[PDB]
Amino acid sequence: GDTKEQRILRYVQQNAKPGDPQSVLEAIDTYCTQKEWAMNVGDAKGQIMDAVIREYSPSLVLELGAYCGYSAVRMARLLQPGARLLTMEINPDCAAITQQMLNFAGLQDKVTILNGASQDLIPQLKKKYDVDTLDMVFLDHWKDRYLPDTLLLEECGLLRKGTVLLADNVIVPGTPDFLAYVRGSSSFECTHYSSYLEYMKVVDGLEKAIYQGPSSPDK
Ligand SMILES: COc1ccc([C@@H](C)c2cc(-c3sc(C)nc3C)[nH]n2)cc1
Ligand code: NA
Ligand code: NA
Structure with a gap:
């Protein structure tokens, strides 16, 4: 029967406008803050994401943890022609919702959705998805996987x-x-972006870590 993720999608399809990513973002944020709580990056963190994308204008982006497609819509709408988002989603039903969300937004040709676990999919990127190196990675999947998947990407x-x-x-x-x-590794240059979770009344944050290249062996 009905699920929260199906409801988010229906709300967007009813209230947003096809081909208009901004309206899709606003409908999701409205739904999650007025109708029903959901795991959602939200507009405040969204503006930080927007600024990072605009600063670095990445040509190839990897997202871990698509859920309903909010972040995928957020990032893909700012990508240049020929730029690509690859997004990984471990739950098949959520992968399906994310695809319909992107289709409605008009962004389906900018995004490839991979349904599976990050640690299984990441080692296939070079062979199967014609990846050389990634310009940007957005991590928003299982929290105990941020470190091992970062080590795996390296x-x-x-x-x-x-x-x-x-x-x-x-x-x-x-x-x-x-x-x-x-923060401790010389391979990453880190900055922290604080952002309030109002519905929880606690400050959260995003970390930006810029890869510097691998550590040098001792001479
Ligand atoms: C309980 O906390 C959460 C956090 C995030 C999610 C969703 C967004 C999610 C996670 C993933 C994973 S997990 C993994 C090993 N690879 C991927 C691609 N895909 N989608 C679900 C529950
Ligand atoms: Na999140
Ligand atoms: Na560091």
Whole structure:
């Protein structure tokens, strides 16, 4: 029967306008703040994401954890012609919702949705999806996977100097292992973007970690 994710999608299809990504974002944010709570990056963090995308104008973006497609719509709407978003989603029903969301938004040709676990899919990017290196990675999937997937991206050769990692929810509920690693490592140049979760009345944040290249062996 009915699910919250189906309801989000229906609300968008009813109230937003096809081919208009901004209206889709606004409908989702309206739904999640007025009608029914849902895992959602939200407009405040959304504006931080927008600014990062505009600053670095990435040609190839990897998103981990699409859910209903809010972040995919958010980022893909700002991508240049020929730029690509690859988004990974472990739940088949959510992957389907994300595809319909993007189709409605008119962004389906900018996005490839991969249905599976990050640690299974990431090592296939070079062979199967013609990836050299990624320009940007958005992490918003299972929080205990931020660190191991970041380490995996590095060893698979998917990061280059200047690749931007942007990670959500690093304070609430928190990813302290990930923060300790990237802030402490000379391979990552880190900045923190605080943002309030009003519905929870606690400050959260996004971490931006810019890959510097691998660590040098001792001489
Ligand atoms: C309980 O916290 C959460 C957080 C996020 C999600 C959704 C957004 C999600 C997570 C994923 C994963 S997990 C994994 C090993 N690879 C992927 C691609 N896809 N989609 C669900 C529950
Ligand atoms: Na999130
Ligand atoms: Na660092």
